[PDB]
């Protein structure tokens, strides 16, 4: 017998086969399954998750709520006519402990896998878990994660997974600094000058029509006038991020620490 | 594209055999899935046979041999590859899809997102082969994804791989029942193997000591673990030509667990250069 769901109500299961049993008998009455995947903590950049996968006609949207090894959330779920919330413990994720794992291509040891190893072997598991639980006609990922997102792209490929990738434009706050739950850690001067992240992104951006090299100058001219922003990596690549073609699409990466926090962002380059 | 019931339809595109699959399952038939390597004997034929049984089935038997779960020099050139038989004994047997996709289409990015199995892998079999299991469960997740049966169905010969494919599918939450099938035999109890065909006509008489160990320590088990064990080994010892690699009486779940009251004993073998595999159940003490 099907759990309980109430249409148009926020409906919250926390046994993945609860949410899977509720999920197939939905899909079987003709509605698309959408996943938006995150950690809780809630802001606007996850919210613009949400409204993409609210658009699809036909949609109902699971947020799932899952942090790897709240009343609040829950309350701006229902305020965005999600459907479905999707929060297991650690314990009903990992009911036998990390045991079979995924494991990525070599792309995940570059950019953030310098600092972070086996962080993308964590993330693409818990992905994979997501998606076979759920099993999603959509599965929604920000910009802002640009790696992870060419990553989960990867996986999908790669295991012969059969649900769309949909990556969402990064929400920013007002002079351009990426969203991020992290944010609110930064003190005045630190918040001050990470602007410097998006104005370099930007700035390059514009810069390309003289170039790559023109590009990544004017990118390093603007986080050079900051204090403060340790610069872990400044990179173009090409958009799936191998090496960056003579001409033609691409995306430039940057990663920095302001005090204890790093912080990320990432935008799409035309060259020439 | 098209699918003719009631005879064996061949695909090799992946997208073929899912368009397929998932056509078929709307219409309300189960899929059943029975991987394979080809070259197919009777023991592979019983897992057609379980799956065709369930009712309202339709059997799709894939047939494929890695650049993957073999690990050089060497082995991967040497695998039995009879196609043409295959399709034969598959059209026999009423089964009405088989998928034969081709290295590229499977390896279309090489090695790249790939399956971590956990420490099971590196024991037994994986022993030697620390990267064996990493391939087959590789392949085993993508034909699962391309085909999302309801049931697959693996042999208990191969028991530690079937015991990984359990992890799998209870670790990444698939949405499949794995079915294991016992073990098929020859009448004098040889355990069914494409391997078999490398065994000269002595060393297929010698090699009757595998499964004559294991159900000898299985009837020994009465008198417990340590009776088990040595009635195996001296059934072993007494076998001309047969170099054991291993013989291990392990838990179930061949897991971090002790021995209780069941058990599997597994034993591997050379017999000159063919290396032969066979396992059976045993009850401690009953
Ligand atoms: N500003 C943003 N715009 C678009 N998507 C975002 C934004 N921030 C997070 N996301 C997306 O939300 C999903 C959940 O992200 P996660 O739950 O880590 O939050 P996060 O803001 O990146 O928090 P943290 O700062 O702790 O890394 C991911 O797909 C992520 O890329
Ligand atoms: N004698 C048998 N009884 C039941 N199942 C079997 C038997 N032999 C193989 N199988 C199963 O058939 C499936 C396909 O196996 P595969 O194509 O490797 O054949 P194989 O006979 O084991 O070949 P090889 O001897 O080359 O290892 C696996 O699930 C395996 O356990
Ligand atoms: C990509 N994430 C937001 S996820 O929900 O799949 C996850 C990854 C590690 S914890 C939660
Ligand atoms: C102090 N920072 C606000 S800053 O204005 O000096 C800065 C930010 C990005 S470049 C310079
Ligand atoms: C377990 N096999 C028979 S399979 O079809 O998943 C496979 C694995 C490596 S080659 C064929
Ligand atoms: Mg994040
Ligand atoms: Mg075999």
Excluded: C, W
């Amino acid at each position: 017998a099907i759990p309980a769901f109430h249409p148009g109500e926020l409906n919250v299961y926390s046994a993945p086969g609860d949410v899977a049993d509720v999920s197939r008998a939905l899909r079987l009455t003709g509605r698309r399954v959408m996943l938006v995947p995150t950690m809780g903590a809630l802001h606007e950049g996850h919210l613009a998750l949400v409204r993409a996968a609210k658009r699809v006609p036909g949609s109902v949207v699971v947020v799932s709520i899952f942090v790897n090894p709240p009343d609040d959330d829950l309350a701006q779920l229902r305020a965005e006519g999600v459907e479905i919330a999707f929060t297991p413990t650690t314990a009903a994720m990992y009911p036998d402990g990390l045991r079979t794992t995924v494991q990525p291509g070599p792309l995940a040891a570059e950019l953030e896998g310098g600092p972070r190893p086996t962080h993308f072997a964590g993330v693409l598991t818990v992905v994979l878990k997501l998606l076979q639980i759920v099993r999603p006609d959509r599965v929604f990922f920000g910009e802002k994660d640009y790696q992870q997102l060419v990553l989960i792209r990867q996986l999908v490929a790669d295991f012969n997974l059969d649900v769309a990738v949909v990556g969402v434009p990064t929400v920013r706050e007002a002079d351009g600094l990426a969203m991020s739950s992290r944010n609110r850690y930064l003190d005045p001067a630190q918040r001050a000058a990470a602007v410097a992240l998006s104005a370099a992104l930007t700035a390059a951006a514009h810069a390309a029509t003289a170039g790559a090299q023109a590009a990544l100058d004017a990118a390093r001219a603007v986080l050079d006038a900051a204090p403060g922003v340790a610069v872990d990596y400044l990179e173009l690549r090409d958009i799936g991020l191998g090496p960056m073609p003579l001409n033609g699409s691409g995306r430039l990466l940057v990663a920095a620490r302001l005090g204890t926090t790093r912080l990320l962002d990432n935008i799409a380059i035309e060259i020439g």
